[PDB]
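Usage example:
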Amino acid sequence: MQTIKCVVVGDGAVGKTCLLISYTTNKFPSEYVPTVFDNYAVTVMIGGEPYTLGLFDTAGQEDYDRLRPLSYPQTDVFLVCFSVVSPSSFENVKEKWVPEITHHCPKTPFLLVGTQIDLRDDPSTIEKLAKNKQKPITPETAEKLARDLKAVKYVECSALTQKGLKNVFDEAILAALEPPEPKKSRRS
Amino acid sequence: EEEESLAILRRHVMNELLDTERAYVEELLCVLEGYAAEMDNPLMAHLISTGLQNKKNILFGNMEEIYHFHNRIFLRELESCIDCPELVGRCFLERMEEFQIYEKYCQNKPRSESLWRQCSDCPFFQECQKKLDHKLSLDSYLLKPVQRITKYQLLLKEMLKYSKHCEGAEDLQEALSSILGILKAVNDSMHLIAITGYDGNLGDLGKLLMQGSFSVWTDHKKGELARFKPMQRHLFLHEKAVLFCKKREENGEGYEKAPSYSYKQSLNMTAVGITENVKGDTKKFEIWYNAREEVYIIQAPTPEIKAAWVNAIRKVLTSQLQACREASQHRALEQSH
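Running the assembly step on the lines above writes:
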């Protein structure tokens, strides 16, 4: 059974763990959001053949630049996450994450993933962003960054409502099935 | 009532802490027996080469020691906090020294990785995996120790969040800071062991206090430089000196992506001075030598990092001042004639 290694990277607090739990349990952790997501194996069917989608979280390792890369070897696809309601996490995509996975895994494809899209409609959240001259990141802005950083695609989701959630991993499976290719300048 | 809620939320963190500790222990064990012990099984000897068998300690590092510690001490101690989760902080504080074993495992991890890059395909492994009915490879389990030490901080921060009014909130905050302290020390040391070209014992420089990459300008007294365009240097702040190294992002074969650092120079702390504020940039500070006859304008990536470095350097300079003070006081008492 072939294995597809998928590693979720991104700033702390962008919902990496929550996103993985929501996708594997099919229900948002209503009462208490777990802190830990252990390496998970999800059987998925490709060409009528069973594959193992291996999911790896990195929550907690964001501040350690020497421990953090230990999870990268033999990754088939990365999910570079940033919260659509956190401009700083979006800036780190460009300044920190992509540069890093690009260095360690040159031929490994990655998707730009915007999380917590449900918060674009959360009063409290938008108000806080307001008291700082900030607004949520728009899909258009994210699609441009994805294009400029040679990400396979830009996808966004909500762990809460699961909107776009399954599609994020479908796209990750598709990108991983691609043959070893050098970063390409996508169109659009 | 808010009290009841927080108490309930405290219970959830304890459950997760305890459930994840157990899975962690069982997982280290299934791999220690399903792979490590299997390298010495005659019935298997025909699938593994002797080269691999001798590199067992490199593949698993001190996982067994870690397993034993958690499976004989820590798990048992966490279980004794169930009835009162807020006291779990004390639990960590009492074993801080024991966690030092994670440094060994983390420093060896990249080494193990290099080995796995060449024998991951080996029939021995593919076989052990089938016997275990595992869908994830061995290296994925080899990451668990690294993943585990970097969750405790998250769990403690969570417990603390639901224990602000509990008798024991202080121990939680100290346990969190201590755990963050060990994670910092381990991470810092990964940079240290990557220094090359250093003639001498790095251990004689005293404890490593800080490390980081910086843009650096030189403003040395009249009579490598970086007058206008900053140069890139990775600095290592030790109790007795500041080491400057050049990041060697260059690779070779079997590409280890972790960069190494070529030692360039060393500034003795006895003649080091500092300048906290620089014109035009809040994230700049200066480290000068021999009363400014040599000056390094350091630009930190963030103001917070700059502050962290200034404070750490000042603690060191302060202790240096007191040490001399004490010294010139004892030999000053020599007025006994």
